[PDB]
Amino acid sequence: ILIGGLGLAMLVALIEFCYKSRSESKR
Amino acid sequence: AFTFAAFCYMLTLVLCASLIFFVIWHIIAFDELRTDFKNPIDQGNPARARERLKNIERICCLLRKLVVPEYSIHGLFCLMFLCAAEWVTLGLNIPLLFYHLWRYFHRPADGSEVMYDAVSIMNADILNYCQKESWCKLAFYLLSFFYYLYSMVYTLVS
């Protein structure tokens, strides 16, 4: 469970990174 | 069955994605640097020159801020495989460890204050060397990721 959560956290951080980058490039 | 080595392999598998991300960022930044370099470097417009210089400085700062995590995380991998007594993987990983150590602690640039220096950067030799190093490192990290996955599965099933 710990490893799965770490991997999911990395994935969600990547998603947030892309989303925030796009929203900022909009700004 | 589940054991210490298998957990080490799982954790290294999770952390190697970060190294892949770092090298991909490296190559993207160096592709941008090449787009700036091979493209005409005329600085007739003071505003254009200032913008180009600040872009170069920003990219250099980003790369410098982003190097220590890679090297230290790979050192963590080496330490883990030492403690778990996985000798083969440790042997495969020691050469890159020493290469990173040498790269960080030599500063072949005469300035010897930063690994990447905006003034020394934009040089074709240094740019191309960094590009090739990043590409080879990406290939190595992909191969090591798949090797770690295979070893994890092997250790689990047995």
Partner: protein, 137 residues
């Protein structure tokens, strides 16, 4: 700690990395493992995922430690190091010898089984004398 550091550096809340560097990440994780509190808790979904799974891990591990220690302290179990003779041949910490000038030594001497051949080798190459002169001895 490393994953929290990465997730907070390159995907910050938006500042968010002066908090949850590597040092403070290690500190947060350690304070979590020891059931203490925190001077900082993550605000991003990824850091919060990491913290939640770490919290579950800590809870389970501390409970298991306490429970198994209660078991140990409640039930005494003394294990004999030896339950056979091969175990006795492999072991070198424990010494063993027969009565000197007897039928048991004559048995071990003329043996053909591997284990007793090893025991005879040991008893013939043992210092001091494992052998004995009387049963009471």
């Amino acid at each position: 700690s490393v994953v929290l550091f990465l997730v907070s550096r390159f995907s910050p809340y938006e500042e968010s990395t002066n908090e949850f560097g590597i040092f403070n990440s290690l500190w947060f994780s350690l304070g979590a493992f020891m059931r203490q509190g925190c001077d900082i808790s993550p605000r991003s979904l990824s850091g919060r995922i990491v913290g939640g799974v770490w919290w579950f891990f800590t809870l389970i591990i501390i409970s298991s430690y306490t429970a198994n220690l209660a078991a140990f302290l409640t039930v005494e179990r003394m294990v004999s190091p030896i339950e056979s003779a091969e175990d006795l041949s492999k072991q070198t910490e424990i010494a063993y010898g027969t009565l000197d000038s007897g039928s048991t030594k004559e048995f071990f001497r003329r043996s053909k089984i591997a284990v007793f051949d090893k025991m005879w080798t040991y008893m013939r190459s043992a210092e001091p004398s494992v052998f004995v002169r009387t049963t009471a001895e």
